[PDB]
C-alpha cells in the first residue's frame, strides 16, 4: 500500500502568469488541471499545500510526505531539484499534454483521471522507481560554489543540488568554444576542445544527451550507400537500423553509469581529441575556461572557470524515489 | 602580376598582451613572426601600418591596397569582417603554427619564408580565390541592429558585417533551448526547436558546421554491425566509409549555397521537427526567442529576440578576394 496524509504540490508558472506577475487557453487549461488534482487529493483526506517557484522551499518539502509536480519535466526537475532524501516520493502530473512532453510525469490518462492513480496507490497497483542522480564535488582554486537559480586553494565540497537529467559544462557565450582537461574513472588527463560536455543519467539519456548523439535517418542513408560504394536495402530498413542504433543511446534510470559526451569537439592537427561518448562511474573536469558555468537540469548554475575542479559521480543515497503506473 | 604599395597588418593580441593590457614563449614567437613579416614587406618598398583590435578601423583598410592578418582564422575572420569590397585582397599569415590552425592563412612555409610568397605575388605564381560570404537582413518588430563586438514595425536593413564562416542563432544561455520559425528558399514556415542553427559558407563548412554534423568512426562502426544484424568489413574499411561521408559535409568556398543545419533539434510527439541540414540559396528565420543573439564568425553579435526577422543569402558583391599558394 501507499497513501500520504500531507502533500505539497508545486505548479509550473504559465506564460500568462510570467507576464502578469493564444496564451490564455494555455493558462485556463493548466489551472483546470491543478484544480482537478487538488480536489482529487482533498477528496481523499489529504492536507495539500499548493506553491509556485519561490514558495516551494525545502521547508515545504520536509512538511509533506510526498511532492507533486503539476507541470512538465522542468517542473519535475524543479521539484526533484529540492529533494535529497531517497525515501521521499516525487511525483509529476503532465498538466498540459498538448505542450508539456512530461517524460518524467505519469501517463496522461491520470491527468483528468487523477483519483484513479490515487486508488492505484492505496492499493499498490504500481511500482517504485529510484532514478539515479548525479552529484558534484567542486574543488580547486578561486571556485565559487554559490548556486544560481537560472529561472530568475580549497578542497572538495558538495554542491547543493543533485542532477537528475544531466550536468552541462561550457562557456556561457554560446560561440566561445570550451577548453578543459577531463578524467574518466580516474584516467590520465585529456585536453578536449568542444562546445561543451553533457553528463546525463539514464533519466536524461533521453533528454539533452539524446539530441546530441542521435543520428539522422539521412546520415544513415548516406553512410550505407557509401558502404556498398566504398546486400542493399530500402526505406523500411533505414529505420530498422537507425533506431537500433539510437536505442543504444538510452539506458535504464536505475543503472548507475554516467553517460558523458563531448559536444562538438574540434578535430585537426593542433587539437587532437579523444572519444565522443562512453559510459563511466566517475568523471573529473579541470576548467581551463574563461567564463563557463556548470548547468544542472537546465535550472541551477555554478561558476566554473579556470583552476576549478568539478568531479561527478553517482551515489545511491541520491536515487530519486519515483513511482510508475500502467 | 600583383604587388601593393600600401599594406595594413592586423596582428592578433596574444594572451600575454591580453593580461598586460608558458604564455611568454607564446608571445615571443608571435612577435618573431610579425617582425619577419613587416621587415620582409619593408624590404620590398611597401609602406606598412601595423595595428591591433581597436586601431584596425575601416579607415586603415581604405588606405591600404591590401590587408594582412598576422594570427589565425580568428584574425582572418577579424580582418575579413571589416572588408566589404570584393576587390580588396585579404591575406592571412599563420603566425603561430603550433597553436593557430590557420585554415584561412597561407601555407606554413610562408610564415618564416615570407619574401617567397611576395615574389610569388610580383610574379603571379599564385591564384585568386573569392570566397563567398553570407549577408544578413533584419526586419520585424522591436529589432536592434547595432552590432556588438564580442571581443570586448520596421523594414529590412542590411547589417554591417558579412559572415565568412557562419552565422550562429540561438539563446545566449547555453541551456535554454531555442524556438523560431524558419523558411528556406522561400518555403512554408516550419517551427523548429533546437540548441541553435548554423548557416555556414563553404569556407566555414570546415569550421563550426563540420563538428556539428560530422559522425564518429564509432557511430559508423555501430551502424554497420547493426546493419548486418538488422558483406562485412574491418577497421580499414570503417575509415574509407566514414570520411567519404564526412567529405560530403564540405563544399568549395566559391560555391554560393548556404549550408544550414539544425543544432540538436528536439524529437517527440509535441515537437515534430524538419531536417538536420541541407543546402540553400536563401534562409529566413523568425525569432520566437526570449534572449537569443545572431553571432557572425564568432565575433560580432546582434540582438535577435521575438518578432525580429533575419534573412540570410549570398550576394556576389560579398565574395572575399583571397589568394592561394602551392
Ligand atoms: N536541444 C536540447 O536537446 C535541449 C536543450 C536544453 C535543455 N534540454 C533538456 O531539457 C531539461 C531542462 O528542463 P526543461 O524540460 O524545463 O526544458 P525544456 O525546454 O522543457 O526541454 C525540451 C523538452 O525535453 C523534454 N524533457 C525534459 N526532460 C526530459 C527527460 N529527463 N527525458 C525526456 N525528455 C525530457 C521536455 O519535456 P517537458 O515539456 O515536459 O519539459 C521539453 O519539452 C534539461 O534536462 C535538458 O536536458 C534539451
Ligand atoms: N566547437 C566548434 O566547432 C566551434 C565553436 C565555436 C566557434 N567555432 C568556429 O571558430 C570561428 C570563430 O573564430 P576563432 O577561430 O577565433 O575561434 P577558434 O577558437 O580559434 O575556433 C576553433 C578552431 O577552428 C579553426 N577555424 C576557425 N575558422 C575556420 C575555418 N573557416 N575553417 C576551418 N577551420 C577554422 C580555428 O583555427 P585558428 O586557431 O587559426 O583560429 C580554431 O583553432 C567561428 O567561425 C566558428 O565557426 C567552432
Ligand atoms: Mg519544459
Ligand atoms: Mg582562434
Coordinates of N, CA and C in Angstrom, one line a residue, chain A residues 18 97-99 101 150 168 171-175 195 208 211-212 214 218-220 222-224 226-231 237 240-241 244-245 263-270 275 290 295 298, chain B residues 18 97-99 101 150 168 171-175 195 208 211-212 214 218-220 222-224 226-231 237 240-241 244-245 263-270 275 290 295 298:
Chain A
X18 N 3.7 34.5 -16.1 CA 5.0 35.0 -16.3 C 5.0 36.5 -16.6
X97 N -1.0 18.3 -21.6 CA -0.4 17.3 -22.6 C -0.4 17.7 -24.1
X98 N -0.9 18.9 -24.5 CA -0.5 19.2 -25.9 C 0.8 20.0 -26.0
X99 N 1.3 20.6 -24.9 CA 2.5 21.3 -24.9 C 3.6 20.5 -24.0
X101 N 5.7 17.8 -22.8 CA 6.0 16.3 -23.0 C 5.7 15.5 -21.7
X150 N 18.7 29.7 -12.3 CA 18.6 30.2 -13.7 C 17.3 30.8 -14.0
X168 N 25.5 20.2 -17.5 CA 26.1 20.8 -18.7 C 27.3 21.7 -18.3
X171 N 31.3 27.2 -22.0 CA 31.3 28.7 -22.0 C 29.9 29.2 -22.1
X172 N 29.7 30.3 -21.3 CA 28.3 31.0 -21.3 C 28.0 31.5 -22.7
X173 N 28.9 32.3 -23.2 CA 28.8 32.8 -24.6 C 28.7 31.5 -25.5
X174 N 27.6 31.4 -26.2 CA 27.4 30.1 -27.0 C 28.4 29.9 -28.1
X175 N 29.1 31.0 -28.5 CA 30.1 30.9 -29.6 C 31.5 30.7 -29.2
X195 N 32.2 22.5 -27.8 CA 31.1 23.4 -27.5 C 30.5 22.9 -26.1
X208 N 18.7 15.9 -23.0 CA 19.6 16.6 -23.9 C 20.5 15.6 -24.6
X211 N 19.6 14.3 -28.1 CA 19.6 15.1 -29.3 C 21.0 15.4 -29.8
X212 N 22.0 15.4 -28.9 CA 23.3 15.5 -29.4 C 23.7 14.2 -30.2
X214 N 22.2 11.3 -31.1 CA 21.4 10.6 -32.1 C 21.8 11.1 -33.6
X218 N 18.8 10.2 -42.5 CA 19.5 10.6 -43.7 C 21.0 10.2 -43.6
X219 N 21.7 10.7 -42.5 CA 23.1 10.4 -42.3 C 23.3 8.9 -42.3
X220 N 22.2 8.1 -41.9 CA 22.3 6.7 -42.1 C 22.2 6.3 -43.6
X222 N 23.0 8.0 -46.2 CA 24.3 8.3 -46.8 C 25.3 7.2 -46.5
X223 N 25.6 7.0 -45.3 CA 26.6 6.1 -44.9 C 26.5 4.7 -45.5
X224 N 25.2 4.3 -45.8 CA 25.0 3.0 -46.2 C 25.3 2.8 -47.7
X226 N 27.3 4.8 -49.3 CA 28.7 4.9 -49.3 C 29.4 3.6 -48.9
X227 N 28.7 2.7 -48.2 CA 29.3 1.4 -47.8 C 29.4 0.5 -49.0
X228 N 28.3 0.3 -49.7 CA 28.4 -0.5 -50.9 C 29.2 0.2 -52.0
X229 N 29.2 1.5 -52.0 CA 30.1 2.3 -52.8 C 31.5 2.0 -52.5
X230 N 31.9 2.4 -51.3 CA 33.3 2.3 -50.8 C 33.8 0.8 -50.9
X231 N 24.6 -6.4 -49.2 CA 23.2 -6.7 -49.7 C 22.4 -5.4 -49.4
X237 N 14.2 -0.5 -44.2 CA 15.3 -1.0 -43.5 C 16.1 0.2 -42.8
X240 N 14.9 0.5 -39.4 CA 15.1 -0.7 -38.6 C 16.6 -0.9 -38.3
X241 N 17.4 0.0 -38.9 CA 18.8 0.1 -38.5 C 19.1 1.3 -37.7
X244 N 17.7 1.0 -33.9 CA 18.5 0.1 -33.2 C 19.9 0.7 -32.8
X245 N 20.4 1.6 -33.7 CA 21.5 2.4 -33.2 C 21.1 3.4 -32.1
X263 N 30.5 17.6 -26.7 CA 29.5 18.3 -27.5 C 30.3 19.1 -28.6
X264 N 30.4 18.5 -29.8 CA 31.0 19.1 -30.9 C 32.5 19.4 -30.5
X265 N 33.3 18.4 -30.5 CA 34.7 18.6 -30.3 C 35.4 19.2 -31.5
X266 N 36.7 19.4 -31.5 CA 37.3 20.0 -32.6 C 38.5 19.2 -33.1
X267 N 38.5 18.9 -34.4 CA 39.4 17.9 -35.0 C 40.8 18.5 -35.2
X268 N 41.4 18.3 -36.4 CA 42.6 18.9 -36.9 C 44.0 18.4 -36.3
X269 N 45.0 19.1 -36.6 CA 46.4 18.8 -36.3 C 47.0 19.5 -35.1
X270 N 46.3 20.4 -34.5 CA 46.6 21.1 -33.3 C 45.7 20.7 -32.2
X275 N 37.4 10.5 -27.4 CA 36.1 10.0 -27.9 C 35.0 11.0 -27.8
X290 N 37.4 30.5 -19.4 CA 37.5 31.9 -19.1 C 36.2 32.4 -18.4
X295 N 25.9 23.7 -15.3 CA 24.4 23.8 -15.5 C 23.7 22.5 -15.3
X298 N 19.3 22.1 -16.5 CA 19.0 23.4 -17.1 C 18.2 24.3 -16.1
Chain B
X18 N 46.9 40.2 -23.6 CA 45.6 40.3 -23.1 C 45.5 40.6 -21.6
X97 N 52.2 28.5 -35.8 CA 51.8 27.2 -36.3 C 51.7 26.0 -35.3
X98 N 52.2 26.1 -34.1 CA 51.9 25.0 -33.1 C 50.5 25.2 -32.4
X99 N 50.0 26.4 -32.4 CA 48.7 26.7 -31.8 C 47.6 27.1 -32.8
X101 N 45.6 27.0 -35.9 CA 45.3 26.2 -37.1 C 45.6 27.0 -38.4
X150 N 32.0 41.1 -29.9 CA 32.1 40.1 -28.8 C 33.4 40.2 -28.2
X168 N 25.6 32.1 -36.4 CA 25.0 31.3 -35.4 C 23.8 32.1 -34.7
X171 N 19.7 30.9 -28.2 CA 19.7 31.5 -26.9 C 21.0 31.8 -26.4
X172 N 21.2 32.9 -25.7 CA 22.5 33.2 -25.1 C 22.9 32.2 -24.0
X173 N 22.0 32.0 -23.1 CA 22.1 31.0 -22.1 C 22.2 29.6 -22.8
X174 N 23.4 29.0 -22.6 CA 23.6 27.8 -23.4 C 22.6 26.7 -23.1
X175 N 21.9 26.7 -22.0 CA 20.9 25.6 -21.7 C 19.5 25.9 -22.1
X195 N 19.1 23.6 -30.1 CA 20.1 24.3 -29.4 C 20.8 25.4 -30.3
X208 N 32.7 25.6 -37.8 CA 31.8 25.0 -36.8 C 30.9 24.0 -37.4
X211 N 32.0 20.2 -37.1 CA 32.0 19.5 -35.9 C 30.6 19.2 -35.3
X212 N 29.6 19.9 -35.8 CA 28.2 19.5 -35.6 C 27.9 18.2 -36.3
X214 N 29.5 16.2 -38.5 CA 30.3 15.0 -38.7 C 30.0 13.9 -37.7
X218 N 33.2 5.6 -34.6 CA 32.5 4.6 -33.8 C 31.0 4.5 -34.2
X219 N 30.3 5.6 -34.2 CA 28.9 5.7 -34.6 C 28.8 5.0 -36.0
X220 N 29.8 5.1 -36.8 CA 29.8 4.3 -38.1 C 30.0 2.8 -37.8
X222 N 29.1 1.1 -35.1 CA 27.8 0.7 -34.6 C 26.9 0.4 -35.7
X223 N 26.6 1.5 -36.5 CA 25.5 1.4 -37.5 C 25.8 0.3 -38.5
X224 N 27.0 -0.2 -38.6 CA 27.3 -1.1 -39.7 C 27.1 -2.6 -39.2
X226 N 25.0 -3.2 -36.8 CA 23.6 -3.1 -36.7 C 22.9 -3.5 -38.1
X227 N 23.6 -3.1 -39.2 CA 23.1 -3.4 -40.5 C 23.0 -4.8 -40.8
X228 N 24.2 -5.5 -40.7 CA 24.1 -7.0 -40.9 C 23.4 -7.7 -39.8
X229 N 23.3 -7.1 -38.6 CA 22.4 -7.6 -37.6 C 21.0 -7.4 -38.0
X230 N 20.5 -6.1 -38.2 CA 19.1 -5.9 -38.5 C 18.7 -6.6 -39.8
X231 N 28.1 -7.8 -46.9 CA 29.5 -8.3 -46.9 C 30.3 -7.5 -45.9
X237 N 38.2 -0.4 -43.4 CA 37.0 0.0 -44.2 C 36.2 1.1 -43.5
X240 N 37.4 4.4 -44.6 CA 37.2 4.6 -46.0 C 35.7 4.6 -46.4
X241 N 34.8 4.5 -45.4 CA 33.4 4.9 -45.5 C 33.1 6.1 -44.7
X244 N 34.4 9.4 -46.6 CA 33.6 9.7 -47.7 C 32.2 10.2 -47.3
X245 N 31.7 9.8 -46.2 CA 30.6 10.5 -45.6 C 30.9 11.9 -45.3
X263 N 20.9 22.6 -34.9 CA 21.9 22.2 -33.9 C 21.1 21.5 -32.8
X264 N 21.1 20.2 -32.8 CA 20.4 19.4 -31.7 C 19.0 19.8 -31.7
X265 N 18.2 19.4 -32.7 CA 16.7 19.6 -32.6 C 16.1 18.7 -31.6
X266 N 14.8 18.8 -31.4 CA 14.1 18.1 -30.3 C 13.0 17.2 -30.9
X267 N 13.1 15.9 -30.7 CA 12.2 14.9 -31.3 C 10.8 14.9 -30.7
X268 N 10.2 13.8 -30.4 CA 9.0 13.5 -29.7 C 7.6 13.8 -30.4
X269 N 6.5 13.8 -29.6 CA 5.2 13.9 -30.1 C 4.5 15.2 -30.0
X270 N 5.2 16.2 -29.3 CA 4.8 17.6 -29.3 C 5.8 18.5 -30.1
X275 N 14.3 18.7 -41.1 CA 15.6 18.0 -41.4 C 16.7 18.6 -40.5
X290 N 13.4 34.4 -26.5 CA 13.3 35.4 -25.4 C 14.6 36.2 -25.2
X295 N 25.1 35.6 -34.2 CA 26.5 35.5 -33.9 C 27.3 35.2 -35.2
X298 N 31.7 34.1 -35.0 CA 32.1 34.2 -33.6 C 32.7 35.5 -33.2

